[model samples]
Target: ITYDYLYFTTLAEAQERMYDYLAQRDNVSAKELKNEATQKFYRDLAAKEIENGGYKITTTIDQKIHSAMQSAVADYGYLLDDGTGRVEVGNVLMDNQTGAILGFVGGRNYQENQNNHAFDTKRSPASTTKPLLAYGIAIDQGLMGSETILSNYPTNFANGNPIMYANSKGTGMMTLGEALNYSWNIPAYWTYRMLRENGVDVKGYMEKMGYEIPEYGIESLPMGGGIEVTVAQHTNGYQTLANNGVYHQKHVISKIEAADGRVVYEYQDKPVQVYSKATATIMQGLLREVLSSRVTTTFKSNLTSLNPTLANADWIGKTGTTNQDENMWLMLSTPRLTLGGWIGHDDNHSLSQQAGYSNNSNYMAHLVNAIQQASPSIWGNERFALDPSVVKSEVLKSTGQKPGKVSVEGKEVEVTGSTVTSYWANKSGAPATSYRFAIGGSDADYQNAWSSIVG
Candidate 1:
């Protein structure tokens, strides 16, 4: 039997102690406790505590998957001490259907550093945000399709600052699909700017998808420079895409049981419909091309060599790297699971090429391959099922419009080019007319379109 004694503590003191405990346990600064969302999360965690001698906190982590994730992180030198100090790596794996956190890797070693990078550390997601904020939203808003032609020329921001790209020399024109496949910055910026000018609720959509947009410099949102997110949050975005546009709240604590055999807490939250199934399906098809096109030789070659199962699986993913290579991310989703990985120095220093660490996305790909090799059965060999509302059409490669005569240089020329297959959400109200202006339109045509929308 336990005897209870009255203890008096001030409300402020109790809150401060709770905040400190949460900050240390979650590896976050106590300053973050001021945020309303962060405060709510901590409150939920506190509500689960039971005053019992013996209690159990049951988590959703799958033992096999957790073991595989640990081994992969250890095997990849993430746990080893190099001359440049320990480079931190964060990973989160979740069930696509249930949003259960199957496994995670917070850092190289938990004992050495209490920082839980997967959930607490926030970094720039880089180009990984393209598929979600730019292309996917553009399609969902009925603005563009997969084969929509976009200008790939040098561009400047509204503030007159020049936009840079991985390949400084931009191609003259490319399809929306090609832009994503090559991860071109200009097209993504153009797409996002277009959405903003057209009165689309871009920030609203991002908030709905669990991304916190910074108050300033959101103009570069599409390029993923200003926004900061954790591995778990980033993975949830892809999980929405993988689960056919439904967002399940990612959680680790499944339930808590008291010593009296009473269930103290259980996770029960409804999933949110972030996007239409047609939109998500079309986006899925576009991302499938990223892997199939083999845009990065290192990614494809390494995966094929390490695990044929993963290389051939129906996977959709995107790679990201922040400016100066301070952050590297790879967000991937299979039919069954969604995984997000990040690699960077703990102090936010650049992973310089001179130090023999560059193209870090390849390292993330290798880590994923290692996990697949360890648990091949977890990732089933099922293909994505597209929505019935999705339709396939052939559009002119030059204009990305319906096949018809159009006035070009004051002459009506028949729209003719090698037709490109494009996918669209038929119910999204996208334009199908041949006269519509697209990114690849002529200078005068583009200026007219831009002025009409922006002015």
Candidate 2:
């Protein structure tokens, strides 16, 4: 903590001046938003303890973060190297029914490496940046969709930067959904260009989406390259889209109990607004199909486990890779887990020439799969033991009251006096038979959905 920040009088005066300054610009009040690193750090530490078969796996904190903490050893001293096959990667686990984060740990770890040294403190977003492609920068502008197409043909940036979309000299167009599956380069790039056509600026979207890329120091981030976001930012951004345009930026803390049996941290479901449910719903469906198609990982085998549809869970996610083969991933168990992953040499280093991207590809998938596998392994059996202990107290009078936003998998559609039937049904492999409705949207519109069921 900075000693200069400890004074209450300075902070109080700053608080007063803060609102006045923001109001002068656009009346924004959420200014004094501190990162609260200690809070996130402790919570993440507890979750990590539960993982790695508990502290016994590698002993104490430094033991568990052994490998990860090696990079930023001086600052983060509790490095625990719990050889449990899971490392520090960006990830979040949410409750499928409530869109609540049950467990979130290790979001983008860049405390060790810095670009020029500024954004370098931020986690290096590998292919995870692609989701930002589909959800935020592009989709919000409504430029492309599951069906929209962009050519893979080599394209040049008129911005005076000499860059090519892909290494292949060949040029071909593929659907927005297809590009997502393949992790195609130009398609994502041009997708952003098209968003610009819709009057949306790339930098502006970055700021809006909570990426504080340096306004004065950081060079311009390429359309789909050279950008970074924290694990929490990536999770919340995806969560907002999953909530159908309603950005609920609330970090869910079910119960925080002190070691002495007193409650220190407490959180309830508060509506954190960002995206609308309608837009959020469409993005959710599209993401499911994208992950189900397994386009990005199609280049490799053994990664079929990462697909939520394949696993019989409602999931959709995006992968990101950098020129240096640093891997960053953003995947969500739709209304359940919005997980992100970042992995690489960690020394501000680069990979081999031929090693290119295919080198250590499993870096992200492995972390995601291992963490995901542990989730159901530990929590899956609990479902049979614990039902909805809390009952719905207030009547859902109307969809209009929903403010039409949230990542809830179940919705109240046709309110025929206590019965709300959903047009959306659970994926065949899901354990139970429930009509899941993303809180903000109705399922009645899609007529041919049933035929598409694989189970």
Candidate 3:
């Protein structure tokens, strides 16, 4: 059970205050506060508070999951803390199907710092926003598909500065799946541009997932660096995707009971259809590529290695980091659960500076694995439900369209090489025989056109 609008002092604070009071009244020393007799006194005080509560707030937090989250945070800090400063972590685990937050860890030690990073702290979500703002919405609007070819060449931002990739070099032409698997910035920018050109409501879709766009005009909106989001809000976005495009309002308090056991308030189910089921199914398959196609940039081990119960279970997720690794994030969704974790310093220092560690944000995966190992039953071997409206077809890598047949010596044969299978929503229609849209165009063109219209 949790509390409603209550601010009780932590046990450490209570102990310190008690020590000061005893010192003034009976000349007690600080060392005496840790003695057996003094410790028992503190326990009695806590027991009184528990027994005298007027009402109880029934929360959805699972005890095992909550304990696992705390242990994971502590272990991460212990392993990585190199005497400079303690690494801070925030995690939010939610039942994607129900939108109930099962567990969360705000920081490494709540006694030292009371800030709840999971619900309170806001930071840039980085590449994690690509799926929600760019790729997923583009597929939903029929502007792009998984096999759509996107240019990965050097591109300019709206301000004329060149957009940069992790390697600071382009890999030329690649399918949308490759772009996402590698988490490239160029394709995401172009995808968002295409959505805007097609008159899709990108911001509206984000808001439906519980994010208020601070500035809609930020050219890096698709890249996820310009806007800030709490872990809970970001988890809600992925929860919407895991729930087959249905957005459910996340809540901790399942119900509130009066002293007499009468329920005063209860949570209600209010599902909002943000994207079509087919669109979500396609997005899930695409994200699974991020995990399956483990390259140097993504997670190294399969999720099943985290725990035995997760073996052969369907998993989809994405990793994110702000510039200079100031904020590290990993969002993983099982068929039933979605966990979003963020790691960083409280003062916004680069995580790369941490001693004895190379990869910064990838540590969140280990933290998530720890939670799964603690509560194995939460993760069942269930597959993501696929919608029938989503059709799979082989597409040409050059055009991202259906393969075309050419007459060869009086025999018509379909093009075999240079084709990859892709998923598309039936509502978006079938892929065209030829490439329909330009890729990696100048953002200046769209901005100039919009400026003239507003002028």
Candidate 4:
């Protein structure tokens, strides 16, 4: 960092240290160091010149945000003399607008594992893969929606493994939004199959979203299990949702200046769209519901216990657990920031249970709160935009109640108990409703409503 003017001392220190290394090779004295051959050796050690003239590397990392991430990791996994007993924590945070890596925490303590979990692509991400790899893509393909109803029965993939919800919430009819809010495995698998059957290359599409899965893919990829990922790819994937289907390659160094103050490298953000802005908006809305839906012991319960600020904040997040609770992940986003976090044991031991779950999501929650409280400019006062191609309305949770109205400009309305949501062809039109997903009500009504509008 340029903040340390003596940062150049690091180079000089290396050169001076090289003398001791050379001494090991030969018992050379100070006078002998001036020899022509030795001068070449010294110069090579310097790698040019150990001088005061040097360019400053301006990083995208916000010091305040970076500090918060460091503190968050330490709070959870700080062990004396290099984090022996404590589980490790690593994370990466990105700026949504610029694809800048705002905060990157390598581990609870770098001396212990020496692994940069923040960018390492070894640990499995678990169910956090849903928004982009599963539901978000499905929505972009017009295979699902905020009001789309899904039967939450015990189903399996074509491979026929029992696909079940994490808890008992898998039984019954749930809207596509509610299924995601609760992280139902059955419905997610169904969506995966539905999309693939319709000729959508789910894996290929996820590759476009920036995940590099193995050739022989894992069956649970849709549910966040199949392949492993780094914090870099994880945060990059979420950038698509934050940017409304566009992604920019995230970078730590925003710019570099020459010693003479000439701009050497200035980061130019190039964004590519992998989905429609409407689909991205809808995906964000669905993920936001994961925090606000208040489902019994779901993502909201795990998060709000640690960071109460989430109760009123406009944000979206997902929590994932995999490998018998060996790896845990938290993916979070707002208009200003996107963060990916993980906590687990390097030895592959099961993480000690936190609350009742075997994951350290609370530490990630602490990280989120820290970012919000300390770096307001980087993480605050941001909101998501709804897409025009979609209509927003309420849906009834109980099948008994039927909405009185069902048509919006000659299309069948998705009727919840209190409101109706409809989809249209207009791409950027103002959203018909606000942030909340359509209220859950009648599956029959939804089908009846969708058949008319879709037909």
Candidate 5:
């Protein structure tokens, strides 16, 4: 371990300062102190440990992975100084099998800024939580299916709150797969409402996936309305789906040994099942749909367009963008690894749309591409396994008759036109139902139907 010291008054004060400093420097503090209530206690304990011939810690950080992550940011990191706005980027790469953080780039340059953006307090999750709360949790509860029809129709929470979409023109009756692949906000809202009304604990599911909520349950889940979580925490949750339903809490130090060659501390993987294997399989496919060969509604185009190298590689993930916080994120869960990236102005400044500049999606795609190109051996040899438990059934589009008219965001709407498709889900138990929300005959009709109704 690297060692350093500072002089203290009478040398004693200096010694205590070193101890406190050491205690606060690492994440293992909770183990050293009994109460862990005061900073003073920490230093004292550190001092004692030091006097007793300090311990050795082995961190999960892999130097090669670290170099690759930093290399990506150094070569492609975003920067802006219109005198006010700037974009910062951070990423974390973890082994889905071991839960060990292979590499972590907290932000563009550590010397440029001391804060670790990867562990930066808590930024809003934006739309990234859709998989956890909407797809993964929804399926775990057996409340929805991959192909279950959801109303991409304009909607709200009964309190006049509108569910907005990135684009106008509801793709008509979208299955759960379509909804997620498209990142359509309306379907997520619909799913959240149905799950909650049926007594499904959306928040509880989130908690199981390793997140904390502090407000209206369902209201805060879809579209990542009011949730806050660090980048590391968010990546950890995605690890659950990557590991096929098991959630593993991340740890920096895997083991610690004393100077005498005695094992002082050892770490083991403790995984908790938050969803069933079947649920994970279906969820995995739906996420992969986001990056499918078809270049349509989803960011699949943005992903490949920005980084063509990623096109041929098989992967599953999602991109999250929010106007509320002007933040963007990309989370990927693959066969060998699970990683996430965030790009935005830290001071809450919005990314400028005035001209040609890279947005979050662009930055993330470049970052991931950089990693893959630089270390193919680490990322090249794996592929996802399909689960037979989750099956696809050809079902009717939207059953029954279409409501000639419907109310949207407190306004009445007319059904000038519509559309449909197949449903994907398990047949062993309850079958997923269907729904029909009309679409406009043309762009103008769609504009009137479910245009940007953001509050």
Candidate 6:
């Protein structure tokens, strides 16, 4: 962070000085570094003092300090004003170190779907293939660190206008950091050279990871192309790296305890470390930079306008888009949370009039900010769902091609004027006994409002 916390020349010096104590053992080990009586007293003191400072305090103390934490979010997600006419957040996952799901609410955003199956309708993910190519897969092979250099370039697509991307002019000519920050697709395509060529081993890794190698030819699975996966898999894939390579079958099991203190429904799950602590730390640090991305002239992120006054906390974000499909997505992970957003039309028809609306979303991010705005205890409950503000009313009016207003009883019912309710008479805005609201082609509209007027 850009915070002015103390810096150490070396871990050993920091350990012996006790300026701030910490257990030096790797987090992947989940064990504390050992200290003995013969060791320096200051070193021992430091270890004892190194705890998540806020969590170590009493329940009451934490409850009290929670006030200070209101403005100091561990991670700031997104807030969106969707069709329901309410504002909310994008997503909220637990901090890896702390089991806080935080806040999220808004409901199932589409039709014929479960409340939580976000990727119920499939759509493509673009550019999102970078982390998988440059970081995820590269780190798996120990081939390229985040700082590695690459040249930016793109190969011509056999089917079209060279498969060229407008944003890829800087391709094949930068460090892995710039390759990622700028999202140069061609360099990412070359980094596939880390695979070197049709090798048996790369093929084997593909099979082991449950995918088809040589994902080309019959289909257009070109380089820098993201394989379509559900939000759950996307979340879990990142979770794999966050958990230091150990993939957990993520679930929402809150408890399994029984009577007599026998620990009836318990199991010890030691996570397997897939990558070294050093490698993981490097990955963590670089991702933090991506989140701290400065607003650019071309594509500034909502991170700045979304919240302008606070310390821009460490976080990384990625955006994915497809011009012809219904899916658009954004993903972010802070040291404390992992969150993602997916938006798509149920029919797979583009929502931006097939013109452009910047994103297709499940509206999950809309709920994330809502949950965070509430009192913590109610963040996950059902009874307090947001209010819908679509005020439905009916009127007796004729339809035509007129541009500004529709006339009723020969009086111009101007569309922009304040809706005048016969307040002294009724709340339903129903028609009188013989009067009716007309939808030029549908009699049901005429009958229903007229019936309600007297019913």
Q: Which stretches of candidate 4 lie over 4 Å from their true place?
A: 3-53, 76-85, 157-160, 166-170, 216-218, 261-264, 294-311, 352-359, 392-419, 422-455
In the range 248-330, model 3's lDDT, one tens digit per residue, is 98877666555888654577989999999989988898888777776423343633454435545787888775346677677
Cα lDDT tens digits for candidate 5, 149-228: 56666555568766566445344555666676667777776677767677876667677766878885546467888887
Write the residue-wise lDDT of candidate 4 on 1-455 in tens digits. 43121123223333444444445457768798769898678667444432443645566666776776667666754421123256776688887777877777777666555677776547777777777776777677765556655556555555866665544534655667667766677666666666666777766666776677875244577766667888877888888788888888877665655577866456687778888887888777777877666441244555567565653467787767643656767677887778887777778677643421323444555667777767655666668878775644443433212244445446455544444453321343223331122233234534544554335
TM-score ranking from best candidate downward = 1, 3, 5, 4, 2, 6
Q: TM-score for all predictions? A: 0.82, 0.51, 0.79, 0.71, 0.76, 0.49
Misplaced by over 4 Å in model 1 are 1-52, 78-85, 167-169, 353-362, 428-436, 440-455
Among these predicted structures, which one has the highest lDDT? 1
Residues 1-455, candidate 2: write the lDDT tens digits: 01111122123323333333333444333443334653344345444433331111111111222222222322321222222222233344443334444433332333442221111235556555655543344544443323333455544555655344335533454444555666666655555555555666656544445666553122214333455565555666666565544454434323333345543333445554443343345456656666666555431233454544334545566655655544434454445445543433445454333222322234434444554444334223211110121111222122211122333235443332222211111121111112321111114311112112111
In order of lDDT, best first, we have 1, 3, 4, 5, 2, 6
Task: Name the runs in model 5 displaced over 4 angstroms.
Answer: 1-39, 47-54, 79-84, 166-172, 216-218, 293-311, 353-358, 399-455
* Per-candidate clashes, comma-separated: 0, 41, 0, 15, 3, 22
Better of 3 and 5 by TM-score: 3
Candidate 4 lDDT score relative to the true structure: 0.62
Error of 1 at 264 (Å): 2.2
RMSD of 2: 15.8
Cα lDDT computed for each candidate against the true fold? 0.70, 0.40, 0.70, 0.62, 0.61, 0.37
Candidate 6, residues 394-416, lDDT tens digits: the string is: 32222111124533335554433
> Mind sharing the TM-score for model 6?
0.49
Task: Determine the backbone clash count of candidate 5.
Answer: 3
How displaced is residue 140 in candidate 3, in Å?
A: 0.4
Q: Cα miss at 84, model 1 (Å)?
A: 6.6
